Symmetry: C2
Subunit: 330 residues, 2 copies
Amino acid sequence: GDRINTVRGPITISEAGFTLTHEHICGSSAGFLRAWPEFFGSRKALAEKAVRGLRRARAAGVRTIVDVSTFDLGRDVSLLAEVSRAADVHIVAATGLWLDPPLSMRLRSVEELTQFFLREIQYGIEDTGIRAGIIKVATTGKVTPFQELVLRAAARASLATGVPVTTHTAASQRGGEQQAAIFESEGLSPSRVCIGHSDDTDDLSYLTALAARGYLIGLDSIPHSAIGLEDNASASALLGIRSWQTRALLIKALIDQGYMKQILVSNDWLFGFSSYVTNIMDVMDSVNPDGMAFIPLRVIPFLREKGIPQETLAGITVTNPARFLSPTLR
Amino acid sequence: DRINTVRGPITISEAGFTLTHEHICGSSAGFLRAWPEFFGSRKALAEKAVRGLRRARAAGVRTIVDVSTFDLGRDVSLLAEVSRAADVHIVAATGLWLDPPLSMRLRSVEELTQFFLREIQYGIEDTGIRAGIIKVATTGKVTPFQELVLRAAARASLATGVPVTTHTAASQRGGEQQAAIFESEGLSPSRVCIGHSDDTDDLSYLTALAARGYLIGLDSIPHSAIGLEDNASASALLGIRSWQTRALLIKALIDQGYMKQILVSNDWLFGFSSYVTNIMDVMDSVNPDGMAFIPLRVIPFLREKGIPQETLAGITVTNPARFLSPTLR
Ligand SMILES: C[As](C)(=O)[O-]
Ligand SMILES: C[As](C)(=O)[O-]
Ligand SMILES: [Zn+2]
Ligand SMILES: [Zn+2]
Ligand SMILES: [Zn+2]
Ligand SMILES: [Zn+2]
């Protein structure tokens, strides 16, 4: 129906407002924030940095973010709840698995993984009672056997609960096509799926064909760019060397092709990032001081100046996330 | 003179009969708290561990060293709970095993050193419980990241006096590469136990390590898949040699004059999610004695082979005390 799970409890979807559909409070690893908080200075410092950042995003018009950190990205839902409340910004938590499953996950069957995802959606995450409102999955270009289990478990959990699925792709590898085939083999509707990191490629043929099938297209890393940082290999590898404008122009491109309803936009920002090289967070913040406010402050005016009507931009940042997040079918 | 446990410091005289390589639960970081139903429930797992420790205690055991690291899903709050209920001392570990997540795998030796030091000097998580041992693991030749872990472990040991204990593939003589790295760092072999050393019959490999002053961890004695050789996963994990065959290594090293260098354990667990489903049931049917296997089966087996009480007490009480007591000499 029209209620979704947030880390402060259930809300009606009209309350979500401007929603960033792919963000992170902290990109980490299972257990890591609690075992080694000084990696982030302190847990308090991290929380305060996130509260400041979310408050700025709120001032810029953001009302909800979707934290697509899974278990193996070190999702700490107690932290998400703390910062959501202090910033007074809705946060939707995720279940699923990303690219770093530990052995206790890697060795599980599709049936076992289905029950883990269902636990996090239907019962709660850890002992917090906080329930996930979305399932996040990730694959390499060519889907591994384990990753295929994860996608099937995600599809089964979605069909059982109605909560949507969102993905990490290598867009230069057209990763969404293999994901989509697996999802549809499970009877999952494309309208319950966002193919993410789709702004990492300029292949409009790939993008429009997925959109034509009813998939949501995640243009979710707009401010990611290492232009000017070419001498930094780790930052280049992570952020790419296409401009944020180049990424943003894909939003216009899909609108022009008639697929405004299939677009979801985000920053894929974080306030801490331990699952990459040390100090990457400082590099990212030096490139994009706006953080999660980058979409409303820079991208929206960029799009309006290009001639895209207000109603279309509002449709993308409010209506599309609302349809996507509302639990649908069963 | 003082050893840190999950209930606080104890004097070496308090440690008594100590099992130096054990696990309450072999898991993954965050896993027990994210999916306790994998083990039935957290309560079920705790209760199994308390009964298990009480059985070990009734067989004479007074302390175990839980060598579960961060990435083996060590939950020291669980360790504290079961230690208290069973009245058995538990020494917690820092270090890294074979499943480091990205947030660990991407770290420098300097960063890893600070993490190991934090868990020894400050406490684990926000519990104030301090590690009393550093556990490391290698495969084969030693990977570049594993080398960083071993060096970080040596540096944390050298700063604190806390000993290092290892996981090897003994069939690949893996202790040799570990020893080389430790010695390059200035670490005394008397601070190092080369573990899973009972997984080979190469006595020349073992005695040579002992002769250099390493402790030899004969720590997986009941691990055997005899009869289960058509169970591939059990066979790869548990091996095809009998427990008597493993146990005879203890006698062999004593007869070579190295009783002071021997540490014995079960390497048991009460839950095990970082392997195939139902492995705990397979393991429990193979060794229904659990952590009581060493005192109930191995000690009488050695006594019947003519090893005197004084020697067995030196191995199970004196050697662990000397090893665990923090020392920079
Ligand atoms: C945590 As990411 C760089 O896959 O959005
Ligand atoms: C957790 As193990 C089988 O390396 O002792
Ligand atoms: Zn991603
Ligand atoms: Zn992301
Ligand atoms: Zn081991
Ligand atoms: Zn072990």
